[PDB]
């Protein structure tokens, strides 16, 4: 690999200003560590990095201080384990012009080998292979990448009882490394925007809540079979495929049709429905009124209760009138459906759907009119039998989504998870119940604070489509990793387990950074 | 010490070898001027520019001749002040890669301070911040930003009043600056910027050119309550909402209905009307024929003439024939109405409306026929009694518009304005005028040479949202500034005044250049 | 001119560190030739090319092995003369970033004259004008242009038809030219050039098929009125506006209404329809289902057959059970229409339309159902009565388009082309034709391996919106050029032609690389 | 505006918000739903009402989670500036959690919909008057 690049790092002028500083470059300090197991395949990539000053601790804080950089940086690797262990690793410096993934053939680029038995550390100096121009802390332009790959797999002769060893990574800047465009310290560009700050501990401990139910988040729920979600959900492209803005507020739809069933004008069950694409007061999407639940309706016939329906309180409002008609005000079961008045069927897709309401108990005096509005409150309560507390609501089938929505499915051994929260439940009027309030797990895709920050800031040039942004969770007994995708869905490396993970013994959350999607999030509980 | 500017430029310049053509750059020359208000908050940016040969007027000219350039530009600021105005500003050179909005702390950069009582000028240098390669003239690429921010708020003691004061900007090329690679001198023009051309002294000092009546523009009329207009009115995105063409031409609608009033065939008022959606003959819009007025109808019955009506001369022409009917030719009031003939009411809304004509004076012989044409001259005269007070025509409530029309409304102390003109008046049949000059004030919101130029050539790029393009009027005594918005409407700094500004004392008009829309336009008559 | 800069390129070049290949390249190799006539006017530009490793063919093969390049290329010119013809051409090396087209003069550039009376070749070195920045082979950036323009007109002493001569160009890399970043010439796909591989000899010869009728391409059809295409179309931005898959696939639509009109349940024409924009089971877009024809319907009346209709074979398929109905199996006309079920009228706008199907002959028993599905095969036949029929199908007026689809209209003398194929026709019981095939012409806008390849790999930033990618088609006798826009339309230089070009006597296809879109593509067949 | 101060219910431990110089205690005004006569037209096109709070909830939750005694000692306000599309003002926060403005004896509502931005001035003495320049 090149070495004349240093003369080119060498060129200065008006970026230097006064009084440049070598800073500390002398010794090697801990950047990172990686694990190598007998499990891992030849041609698998254990460690990768683009050349940057964010590869020492000292040059990452100086990055705020300086606006531009140039030159080489040295990477030192220490294999720890034993001299009795077979296997070999390959470290190679790759020039820019590349897309890294399944076709990027590490063992056919100029490279050096690292042997597992090495007692002493092995060093590489990584130069600049495009040294002609200063990089800012904006776009650097395309830079060389350092990749370490397994050439032949780790062997223990004493069997499978011990099966992994670690390799340390240490760095120091080289001689040719320099900085420029100092200015004075402040915050700047792409550096200040990262998905990291969305998730944090106080939100999961007790400050945060879900985006479907406004509940307190008690758990993490794995969903092996996948799911799809859009309403009040957001991505790292800054937009939503939903019809709700990211806050809880009343459901107002001005044009629907209203009727009642029982052939009696007083003491009857109220019905309201409308087709999708008439939400004239909603800017987000005219498909349904903001605040309307993303679930398919649940059939009930009087006096029988809906088994795990969404219920909210409200009543019927005509457009000419300043406030709703009181006689109509009652609890309603709400959902998305097709086939109103009396051929009702649930719908999982918004295209050709109908937004439907029916009162769970009798209204004082009904109303027959068309068109006329529906006015129902911000968050809902769960309708379900008396002492019911089985699994969670909605199940993946129950969630309604648009045809623009991308679905959440497993990637590798990484499984999508939903955030589980405590919801109010009711067993139908009076009687008895399993407890004082009863147990009930309502689930959402996201914590509402993450949803507000995806809507607030655009993170497209801040997490790549192949990556997850990763944080690690610490529990009193055990720890795990959790990931957020660019499509807004959250993942865990739990595989096919369904067990509820308890956030109530949560000590901590902290970022691990960007990781590629296929590679498994840690689960040790 | 840090490497010399000229040497690093030398490193930037290799494929070129003919070098510098100048021995002269010590004098400073006028770039621009900006205003500093008592409003402008601590931390606000009044003025910013990117590095270019356009930053200096001499380089701007020479740059036409050459394909490439490199080096620095020096910028000098002189405050006008008065010795009694306090406050202070900071000038910073922002190396490239720094996002610019209200989060940018501008005092953490390389910088100098400008005090508002400063007698002496303050200078700063902008070097080349990527001396690694030469810049093209025609496609600069990555360039440093000069930014000026308010360090301390503007302090007036208030011994009179003064709420805006100005800061001048002057520039010169550095001793490292250079041009290279001759190209065609014609590609980039010497002639003044594409909006500026729209307003020059002859449009206003004579000739006649208004966008409604085509009369002589005598004055400027401010509107405190705004207006909307679209017919022959263009915005700088080169789109119209109107129905007439900017080329003045005879009024022709081939399929309309004719009837008469007076209950007798001869010595009667002919009436003619057609639905809005009957105007097939127009290429621009099928909502009213070309050259038909944007004024509502003002009903009358004999002997009365209509007050504040648009009147034009013409007659009825059969649907398929080659010549109009001669006995029907007479003077007619033309206008928008609904429920013609029999429930006839004035309207300024097109949707279901009717375009109508009624004779002022009797036609020799009347006709009832459907369908028929209407043939009436290009431009109208105002019908109003003799002696009777002049109320400018049309009033805003009279002005007819399409639903797509943008409205003209105030900005701060800046108010939307109309151009006032002399238009012919006619009153009582055979009697003395009562007015020695025959006074009337007909109004337009845009002059026609400017309308035709905005329709021919798109200027979106020229004035982006939050700006007005500005010109100054110098009078035999006093001065004023006039601004043009994106939306095509013209603005004045006349506030709540309704007084007509007299343009007959105009000596000259010259472009100030584009300015922020919030800033108040000077009025000093 | 710039021939001193040999030593100043040698600072920018050397940080990379690589060998020089001299011994292989003793001789120059053929690049192109152009024609010079008595009618090519002074100021006209006959030939232009960008600096690129693709100019010498052997350097193109070597480019594969390397990820960067730099240094110059020699160009050698031979005039074919006679020695009795006067006239001159001017050869200039144009700076980077200077736009190319007919507006471009050589007037003030450094140049050499190429003489009509010359008998010796004339050799120019084209130096590198970018040498401080090494170029990528697969993302190169901005380069200079070599241009040859007519200074003096070709003049002949004598009459006859003889009015033209040829000028040949051959090239050799210079002693400054270099390849660097060998890495692994291992597993990159588009090292080979992405755009160039789209058209090949055996693909135009007999392997390729067209992307709408799946026929064998016999010819090229110019459309001098211009045209539009959205479905099964991709482009050099990777984007599309269609609904159908990149390959040909069968029609399955689960959600329709089926009915018939008549006086009986049997020996009737079956009708089925569903709305456009409702196909939520199509991954590509909901405009229609996959496999659905992008041409407007053909209205007909029982018992007559539609002409120039798209007909396909299939039947009614039960949505509840998932299974066909045998009695319904028949040939059907499938099309886009508006006005369903019974006011049907044709459209070319998808929005608010219905995707309609009607049987071309009697079904034994019909079915009236809602909902019911439609299941029809992938392959399509043209409906035409006996012998002599329509010239090509679809005509440009028949084609449907969806918003976002740009239309292709002529530029200068270049005209947009469609690809013609022989397609199967069926129509009217025991019909016949004048020929055995019954010579029926189906047209597609692209060849299907091109539609598939433009959907499989990225192509962004390779071809400039002003330029066309050019290939040369070579016949046993004569040759022509074909071009590709950024948009993914093909164009040819036949001007106001409608005549079909016969591809039967094709020997070869070679890439000519990008050329300005206003450049006429040559036609000598 | 609802509730009026006489309506507001409190525990005996409550600190009071009172003026300092030209600095006055302030409430945050909000749109809250109104309901009147059963079945009749609202009489108001926007449905106007002004519901009031003395602290925003993200600030309340942060002061409850994390103690800031050390940050602002008695005799100080912590200060931020509001920059509007036209004009500016400064806003201060006291130890006692109450927010203050340099509006004096004014009862006029300040419109926050024309807010361009807010930035911290930093901690300042409680006696100093907060700038108001709209």
From TrEMBL, chain D:
Protein localization: Host cytoplasm; Virion
Function of the molecule: Viral genome-linked protein is covalently linked to the 5'-end of the positive-strand, negative-strand genomic RNAs and subgenomic RNA. Acts as a genome-linked replication primer. May recruit ribosome to viral RNA thereby promoting viral proteins translation. Interacts with host translation initiation complex to allow the translation of viral proteins. Probable key protein responsible for the formation of membrane alterations by the virus. Induces the formation of convoluted membranes derived from the host ER. These remodeled membranes probably form the viral factories that contain the replication complex. Together with NS2 and NTPase, initiates the formation of the replication complex.
Full-protein positions shown: 2201 to 2334 of 2344
Protein name: Genome polyprotein
Organism lineage: Viruses, Riboviria, Orthornavirae, Pisuviricota, Pisoniviricetes
Source organism: Rabbit hemorrhagic disease virus (RHDV)
């Amino acid at each position: 690999n090149s070495s004349a690049s240093v003369a080119t790092a060498g060129i200065g002028g008006p970026p230097q200003q006064v009084d440049q500083q070598e800073t500390w470059r002398t010794n090697f300090y801990y950047n990172d560590v990686f694990t190598w197991s007998v499990a891992d395949a030849p041609g698998s990539i254990l460690y990768t990095v683009q050349h940057s000053p964010q590869n020492n601790p000292f040059t990452a804080v100086l990055s705020q201080m300086y606006a531009g950089w140039a030159g080489g940086m040295q990477f030192r690797f220490i294999v720890a384990g034993s001299g009795v262990f077979g296997g070999r690793l390959v470290a190679a410096v790759i020039p820019p012009g590349i897309e890294i993934g399944p076709g990027l053939e590490v063992r056919q680029f100029p490279h050096v080998v690292i042997d597992a038995r090495s007692l002493e550390p092995v060093t590489i100096t990584m130069p600049d292979l495009r040294p002609n121009m200063y990089h800012p802390t904006g776009d650097p332009g395309l830079v060389p990448t350092l990749v370490l790959s397994v050439y032949n797999n780790l062997i223990n002769p004493f069997g499978g009882s011990t099966n992994a060893i670690q390799v340390t990574v240490e760095t120091r800047p080289s001689d040719d490394f320099e900085f420029v465009m100092i200015r004075a310290p402040s915050s700047k560009t792409v550096d200040s925007i990262s998905p990291a700050g969305l998730i944090t501990t106080p939100v999961l401990t007790g400050v945060g809540n879900d985006n479907r139910w406004d509940g307190q988040i008690v758990g993490l729920q794995p969903v092996p079979g996948g799911f799809s979600t859009c309403n009040r959900h957001w991505n790292l492209n800054g937009s939503t495929y939903g019809w709700s803005s990211p806050r809880f507020a009343d459901i107002d739809h001005r044009r629907g049709s209203a009727s009642y069933s029982g052939n009696n004008s007083a003491n009857a069950l109220q019905f309201w429905y409308a087709n999708a694409g008439s939400a004239i007061d909603n800017p987000i999407s005219q498909v349904a009124p903001d605040g309307f639940p993303d679930m398919s309706f649940v059939p009930f016939n009087s006096p029988n209760i809906p088994t795990a329906g969404w219920v909210g309180f409200g009543g019927i409002w005509n457009s000419n009138n300043g406030a709703p008609a009181a006689t109509t005000v009652q609890a309603y079961e709400l959902g998305f459906a097709t086939g109103a008045p009396n051929n009702l069927q649930p719908t999982t897709n918004t295209s050709g759907a109908q937004t439907v309401a029916k009162s769970i108990y009798a209204v004082v005096t009904g109303t027959n009119q068309n068109p006329t509005g529906l006015f129902v409150m911000a968050s809902g309560v769960i309708s379900t039998p008396n002492a019911s507390a089985v699994t969670y609501t909605p199940q993946p089938d129950r969630i309604v989504t648009t045809p623009g929505t991308p679905a959440a499915a497993p990637v590798g051994k990484n499984t999508p998870i939903m955030f589980a929260s405590v919801v109010r439940r009711t067993g139908d009027v009076n009687a008895a119940a399993g407890s004082t309030n009863g147990t009930q797990y309502g689930t959402g895709s996201q914590p509402l604070p993450v949803t507000i920050g995806l809507s607030l800031n655009n993170y497209s040039s801040a997490l790549m489509p192949g990556q997850f942004f990763v944080w690690q969770l610490t529990f009193a007994s055990g720890f795990m990793e959790i990931g957020l995708s660019v499509d807004g869905y959250f993942y865990a490396g739990t595989g096919a387990s369904t067990t509820l993970i308890d956030l109530t013994e949560l000590i901590d959350v902290r970022p691990v950074g960007p990781r590629p999607s296929k590679s498994t999030l840690v689960f040790n509980l």
